[PDB]
């Protein structure tokens, strides 16, 4: 584990991360997809061999020795707010189990269900709070990746408020 486990946020492409493993915002079918998923497919295509997994779960596939944890958040266009909230919390709990099993000291993670699976709603606080609920009991350094300048400021404020 990290000596003083922390949370950080960076505004840049997660495919350029400086962590020991990455979480992909995957689709259930293991397809190249869009957004984060397409960037992950271009950087670590080998990790999409048998990466299909249900909504609410995470499945890790190695690219060489680098782990790619495919975490499938719900598409809020298809799920109700209640059931989607439950599946989003579940996907993050599965990411925490995989990060612990892998023994990594750091992990790069995007906010699940905040892009094309958001159903057109701003889900920064919802998704980030479920990330904290799952990752707080782990001792890996967590680095959250985002692309919007206002989201970077809001995620940074939420991290600092708890310290
Ligand atoms: Cl970039
Ligand atoms: Cl998304
Ligand atoms: Cl963003």
Swiss-Prot record:
Effect of residue 27 to R/Y: Almost complete loss of mono-ADP-ribosylhydrolase activity
Domain of life from the UniProt record: Viruses
Effect caused by changing residue 36 to A: Partial loss of mono-ADP-ribosylhydrolase activity
Consequence of changing residue 13 to A: Partial loss of ADP-ribose 1'' phosphate phosphatase activity
Annotated phenotype, changing residue 117 to V/W: Almost complete loss of mono-ADP-ribosylhydrolase activity
Modification(s) after translation: Phosphorylated by host on serines and threonines.
Sites where the protein binds ADP-D-ribose: 13, 27, 35, 115-117
Effect recorded for residue 36 to E/F: Almost complete loss of mono-ADP-ribosylhydrolase activity
Annotated membrane topology: Peripheral membrane protein
Domain (Macro) ranges: 4-163
Localisation: Host cytoplasmic vesicle membrane
Subunit relationships: Interacts with mRNA-capping enzyme nsP1. Interacts (via C-terminus) with host G3BP1; this interaction inhibits the formation of host stress granules on viral mRNAs and the nsp3-G3BP1 complexes bind viral RNAs and probably orchestrate the assembly of viral replication complexes. Interacts (via C-terminus) with host G3BP2; this interaction inhibits the formation of host stress granules on viral mRNAs and the nsp3-G3BP2 complexes bind viral RNAs and probably orchestrate the assembly of viral replication complexes. Interacts (via C-terminus) with host NAP1L1.
Protein purpose: Seems to be essential for minus-strand RNAs and subgenomic 26S mRNAs synthesis. Displays mono-ADP-ribosylhydrolase activity. ADP-ribosylation is a post-translational modification that controls various processes of the host cell and the virus probably needs to revert it for optimal viral replication. Binds proteins of G3BP family and sequesters them into the viral RNA replication complexes thereby inhibiting the formation of host stress granules on viral mRNAs.
Domain characteristics, as noted in the entry: In the N-terminus, the macro domain displays a mono-ADP-ribosylhydrolase activity. The central part called, the alphavirus unique domain (AUD) has a zinc-binding function. The C-terminus region, also called hypervariable domain (HVD), is mainly disordered and binds several host proteins. This intrinsically disordered domain contains 2 SH3 domain-binding sites and 2 FGDF motifs necessary and sufficient for the formation of nsP3/G3BP complexes.
Protein name: Non-structural protein 3
Lineage summary: Viruses, Riboviria, Orthornavirae, Kitrinoviricota, Alsuviricetes
């Amino acid at each position: 584990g990290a000596m003083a486990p922390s949370y950080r946020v960076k505004r840049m492409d997660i495919a350029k991360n400086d962590e020991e493993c990455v979480v992909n915002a995957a689709n259930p079918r293991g397809l190249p997809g869009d957004g984060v998923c397409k960037a992950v497919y271009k950087k670590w295509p080998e990790s999409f061999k048998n990466s299909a997994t249900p909504v609410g779960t995470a499945k890790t596939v190695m690219c060489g020795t680098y782990p790619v944890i495919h975490a499938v958040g719900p598409n809020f266009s298809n799920y109700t707010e209640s059931e989607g909230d439950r599946e989003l919390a579940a996907a993050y709990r599965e990411v925490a189990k995989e990060v612990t099993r892998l023994g990594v000291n750091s992990v790069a993670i995007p906010l699940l269900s905040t892009g094309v699976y958001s159903g057109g709603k701003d889900r920064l606080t919802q998704s980030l709070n479920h990330l904290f609920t799952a990752m707080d009991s782990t001792d890996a350094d967590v680095v959250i990746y985002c692309r919007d300048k206002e989201w970077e400021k809001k995620i940074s404020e939420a991290i600092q408020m708890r310290t």
